[PDB]
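User: UDP-N-acetylglucosamine transferase subunit ALG13. Structure?
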Amino acid sequence: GIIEEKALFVTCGATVPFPKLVSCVLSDEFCQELIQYGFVRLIIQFGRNYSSEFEHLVQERGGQRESQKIPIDQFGCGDTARQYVLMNGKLKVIGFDFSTKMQSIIRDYSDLVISHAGTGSILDSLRLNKPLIVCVNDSLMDNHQQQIADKFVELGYVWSCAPTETGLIAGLRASQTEKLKPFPVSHNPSFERLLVETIYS
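Assistant: Predicted structure:
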């Protein structure tokens, strides 16, 4: 914490609309809890411009925001990235349209990766040896939701969350309360079939 700054990385798949996943990571509890967990640096990635969805919810709380030259060396975001002010400055949110390897820079920089029903993003965290919280969709069978959770909890390096605006932050509470550690196995095809294919898919 002294030498390196902590950061929480959010990424979404194509399973559901991104705009809908914005409110899941800018909720009252989501922001309020993280600043007590040690995640005051929240970086949320997207490929298509959804910056209006971030500014909107800020205006829905009367907060501030500023387009800043966010260091690539530090976070990985570009100069068009926007900083959003939540929780009276206690939560700093960076939004940026990622292009190439900048999304991998922020991944390595971050401590914890959130996958909103993602696919390659799951492989990425498991490849980069980062701890992974995976939020499932509401199209997934309830039995399959628990089935995946059971095995990821057995693993102890991935945490499954329900398809709500509260299941994620519950897992982000469980990231410290419950056993959740960085994925140690660096074998590409190992977690590909083990975790992604067999269990998740």
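The chain is about 40% helix and 20% strand. The longest strand covers residues 91-97.
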